[PDB]
Amino acid sequence: EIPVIEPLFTKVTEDIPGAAGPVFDKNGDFYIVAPYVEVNGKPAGEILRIDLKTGKKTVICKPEVNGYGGIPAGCQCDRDANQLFVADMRLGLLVVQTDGTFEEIAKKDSEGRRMQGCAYCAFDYEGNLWITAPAGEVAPADFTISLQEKFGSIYCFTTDGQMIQVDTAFQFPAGIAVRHMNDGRPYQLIVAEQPTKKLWSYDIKGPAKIENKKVWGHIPGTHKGGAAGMDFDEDNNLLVANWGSSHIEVFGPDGGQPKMRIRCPFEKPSALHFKPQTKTIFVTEHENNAVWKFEWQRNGKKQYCETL
């Protein structure tokens, strides 16, 4: 029977529709996304900065392109500039500055196909950005999601600036993470397929080059939902938000079944992110549309933005 731990969670902020995309930038500022904010009945999602002492929210960016609003859904911080890479389910991959200005990175992929809306992303230590795209085509196409049909895709945005579609036919691909060798070389890509309760892995052979696709892990529960956001601790244990299960699952480095579970005081953890150089994990959740923090057993895996 999988051991369960029940640490103290502390509320950080609240009232954030669809709270997701927790991230720290290079200065230690903390951000989240509010994907489901609407204006005049249409998408108008937001990227927010959170004051960690008071919980006060500041809107950083409310992305819109040619009158189509964004659904910002997951974030990573860059290394060479203090800017956020934001997966947006209507706009694709955005690069967002702290001053609120932003750019849509690609409208088409390297084969000339229209981009799909993106949900989660993860930098490898070489600076390539691996991205899940569970939505259909970006705005101006009508919004669709691969909850029941297998049209979700996987991308790699390389350091050379190519947006390469590396796989497709996923049923709602969600969290994504890069397992690195001890020497820093990218080794495995892990991809959550949310409703099928599967974690998939590939061997990374280079930028946008994956092979050896296999089922890597299994997500407990039969609840509606499944694996959402995920990230590694510094021992390459993979912590996975199991949306609808009231738990974060903990996988050892070689996957399989969870070796431990973390019980949350809410049903719908959506994403998690470590505060750099600490054991503190920030967790977004959709039961209360709020953000919490708790102490894990060890520090998080160093993010690309902390490397030199």
Author numbering: 2 to 309
Sentences from the paper on this structure:
The resulting variant, VEnT1.0, shows appreciable levels of stereocontrol (85% e.e. for (+)-1a) and substantially improved activity compared with small-molecule thioxanthone as a sensitizer. To further improve enzyme performance, VEnT1.0 was subjected to three rounds of directed evolution. To gain further insights into the catalytic mechanism of VEnT1.3, crystal structures of apo-VEnT1.0 and apo-VEnT1.3 were solved at 1.5-Å and 1.8-Å resolution, respectively. The structures show that the mutations installed during evolution have resulted in a repositioning of the mTX sensitizer. The protein pocket extends the triplet lifetime in VEnT1.0 (τ2 = 6.9 µs) compared with free mTX (τ2 = 5.0 µs) under anaerobic conditions. Interestingly, the large fluorescence emission signal observed with free thioxanothone in aqueous buffer is substantially reduced in VEnT1.0 and VEnT1.3, suggesting that sensitizer confinement in a hydrophobic active site pocket facilitates intersystem crossing to the triplet state.
Recently our laboratory has introduced a powerful mode of photochemistry into proteins, namely triplet energy transfer (EnT) photocatalysis, by developing an enantioselective [2 + 2] cyclase that relies on a genetically programmed benzophenone as a triplet sensitizer. Compared with benzophenones, thioxanthones have strong absorbance features that extend into the visible spectrum and are less susceptible to off-pathway processes that compromise EnT efficiency. Here, we develop engineered translation components to embed thioxanthone triplet sensitizers into proteins.
